[PDB]
């Protein structure tokens, strides 16, 4: 891969009282051409781990296949739920992949978020793993997971990697990251987390040309990994001066 | 024999491979492994009667049933190392197939590839053939169940019920007394326990619960590999012991 051709825009992941909330718009752009409008950019690695990407779709798919087979081998060797790999383990694996490809100067044109639950003490979902049937889609309350038991990690093209209470890629690193550094707080409820993420996505939709308002939300919780129903974010302009007709401005000068 | 049985790459004057025949003897002298196709799934059982004198082994730690993609059972009878090697190759083939085509490898393709892998070691004068018989099985709603047995010579055959290892003749005779295509796996567990108790003379009601491995793929387990829970196994064990004690 000499460079990005078909690309995905930013992803946002945050911690809240019940786990991880990760959001990305379902759009992949072939330059300035929004060719694909229903693309999946968040993938499930196992019952406690998800991966989001921003950048080249081909490299993201390559990494997703690598992680899928890593999970299958883990499941083959598993004897107890403690044997399942953790988000930290997958983050280390992806960071090593990126570092080696940097050394070879054959990078993956991607920024990756690896998020999930770094613990097995909140449920028994990994006692019996189902890969091809999702029983989630019969409702018990969510479990309040400790912040220290959750994991969000970032890897970039040069192999730079770290973790935090919230991670952003792409253009989100400006708008969503400013809003999160201002307003994020620990133990947010699901609705509060969704409201914060929706504000960030709305700002991104207004100020980023490669984004859409068709949003995919994924929750990693004690119930497992849940994909929400994709929804159109309502995004209205915040000023009437935008809508004011141009013919009502003075006809002389540069009023545009 | 007569100098013709010291290598796997030489035929005897009667066109036989005595090394493979000796491997067959070794496998027949080993622990028992059976697979049974039922109405709603397949049950795989392993009787490790050879360890009835190893009283310090961690309970139920020794297992001879594995899975490939979480929906293909694979068990064996023979050398643990050779079987582990073959299972690793089966997992490798499944991984390569998924990488190439983005779908799970079909069971018959996997069986053929494993048969070729096993057969390749019976061709040269510097390699040791695998001393293991493999059982590879799967079940789903549309196709019902598929069971294949691969012999050490690379021959794969399809069955609706198979037994390999020691006492396999008695186990087959007891299994063939009923049609399990119209019996459920939960009901077949008790029959298998009775068969074990009657056939294996080294097995008793005391050691039944720690020298037997039980896995299945069935509707209850969502057609994915599962180990039968002790909560389901214990009542069947008790019923089988009760019946055999009655008679």
The residue ranges of every structural domain in chain A are 5-232
- Whether B70 is in a domain gets the answer yes
Catalytic-residue membership of A221? no
What is the C-alpha separation between B171 and B45, in angstroms, rounded? 12
User: CB B99 to CB A69 under 8 A?
Assistant: yes
- Containing domain of residue B177, as a range? 2-240
Shortest CA gap A72–chain B (Å): 7
- Whether B219 is in a domain gets the answer yes
- Whether B247 is in a domain gets the answer no
What is the C-alpha separation between A89 and A93, in angstroms, rounded? 6
What is the C-alpha separation between A14 and A188, in angstroms, rounded? 10
Structure token digits, residue B151:
């012999």
CATH architecture of the domain A5-232 equals 4-Layer Sandwich (3.60)
User: CB B95 to CB A133 under 8 A?
Assistant: no
- B140 beta partners: B144
Shortest CA gap B206–chain A (Å): 25
Nearest to A225 by CA among A95, A79, A84, A111: A84
- To what resolution in angstroms was this structure determined? 2.6
Sorted by sequence, the CB contacts under 8 Å of residue B236 that are 6+ apart come out as: B186, B189, B190, B193
Please check whether residue A147 is in contact with residue A237, taking contact to mean a CB–CB distance below 8 angstroms: no
Experimental method: cryo-EM
Please check whether residue A101 is in contact with residue A108, taking contact to mean a CB–CB distance below 8 angstroms: yes
Which are the residues after which chain A is interrupted (C to N > 2.5 Å)?
A: 137
User: CB B222 to CB A130 under 8 A?
Assistant: yes
Q: DSSP letter string over chain B?
A: -TTSSS-TT---TTS--HHHHHHHHHHHTS-EEEEEE-SSEEEEEEE-GGGTT-TTSPTT----EEESSSS-EEEEEE-HHHHHHHHHHHHHHHHHHHHHHSSPPPHHHHHHHHHHHHHGGGS-TTSPPP-EEEEEEEEETTTEEEEEEE-TTS-EEEESEEEESTTHHHHHHHHTTS-GGGS-HHHHHHHHHHHHHHH-TT--TTTTTTSEEEEEEETTTTTS-EEPPHHHHHHHHHHHHHHHHH-
B69 Cβ under 8 Å from any chain A Cβ: yes
What is the C-alpha separation between B137 and B78, in angstroms, rounded? 18
* CATH number of the domain where residue B224 is located: 3.60.20.10
Query: How many structural domains comprise chain B?
Result: 1
- Whether B245 is in a domain gets the answer no
Contacts of B95 in chain A (CB under 8 A): 69, 72-73
């Amino acid at each position: 891969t000499l460079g990005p051709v078909v690309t995905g825009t930013s992803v946002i992941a945050i911690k809240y009282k019940h786990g991880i909330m990760i959001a990305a718009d379902r759009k992949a752009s072939y330059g300035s051409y929004a060719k694909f409008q229903n693309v999946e950019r968040i993938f499930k690695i196992n019952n406690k781990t998800v991966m989001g990407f921003s950048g080249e779709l081909a490299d993201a798919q390559y990494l997703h296949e690598l992680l899928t087979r890593k999970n299958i081998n883990n499941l083959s060797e598993k004897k107890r739920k403690e044997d399942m790999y953790t988000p930290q383990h997958y983050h280390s694996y992806v960071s090593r992949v990126f570092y080696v490809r940097k050394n070879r100067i054959d990078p993956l044109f991607n920024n990756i978020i690896i998020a999930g639950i770094n613990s097995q003490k909140y449920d028994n979902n990994d006692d019996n793993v189902l890969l091809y049937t999702n029983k989630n889609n019969n409702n018990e309350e969510y479990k309040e997971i400790h912040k220290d038991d959750l994991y969000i990690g970032f890897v970039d093209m040069h192999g730079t990697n770290f973790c935090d209470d919230y991670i952003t890629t792409g253009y989100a690193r400006y708008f969503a990251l400013t809003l999160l550094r201002d307003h994020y707080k620990d133990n947010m409820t699901e609705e509060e987390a969704r409201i914060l993420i929706n504000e960030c996505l709305r700002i991104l939709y207004f100020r980023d040309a490669t984004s859409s308002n068709f949003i995919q939300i994924v929750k990693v919780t004690s119930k497992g990994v849940e994909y929400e129903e994709p929804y159109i974010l309502p995004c209205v302009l915040n000023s009437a001066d935008y809508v004011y007709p141009s013919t009502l401005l003075p006809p002389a000068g540069c009023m545009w | 024999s007569a100098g013709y049985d010291l290598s796997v790459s030489t035929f005897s004057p009667d066109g036989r491979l005595y090394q493979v025949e000796y491997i067959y003897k070794s496998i027949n002298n080993n622990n028992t492994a059976l697979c049974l196709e039922c109405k709603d799934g397949i049950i795989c059982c392993c009787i490790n009667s050879n360890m009835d004198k190893n009283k310090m082994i961690k309970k139920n730690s020794y297992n001879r049933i594995y899975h490939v993609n979480n929906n293909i059972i694979i068990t064996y009878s023979g050398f643990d190392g050779d079987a582990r090697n073959i299972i690793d190759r089966a997992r490798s083939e499944a991984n390569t197939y998924y990488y190439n085509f983005h779908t799970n490898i079909p069971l018959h393709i996997l069986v053929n590839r494993i048969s070729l892998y096993i057969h390749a070691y019976t061709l040269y004068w510097h390699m040791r053939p695998f001393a293991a018989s493999i059982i590879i099985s799967s079940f789903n709603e549309k196709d019902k169940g598929d069971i294949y047995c691969i012999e050490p010579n690379g021959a794969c055959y399809k069955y609706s019920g198979i037994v390999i290892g020691k006492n396999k003749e008695m186990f087959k005779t007891e299994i063939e007394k009923k049609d399990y295509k119209d019996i459920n796996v939960r009901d077949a567990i008790e029959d298998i326990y009775k068969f074990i108790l009657t056939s294996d003379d080294h097995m008793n009601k005391n050691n039944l619960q720690n020298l037997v491995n039980f896995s299945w793929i069935c509707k209850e387990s969502s057609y994915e590999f599962q180990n039968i829970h002790e909560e389901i196994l214990t009542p069947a064990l008790n019923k089988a012991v009760e019946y055999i004690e009655k008679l």
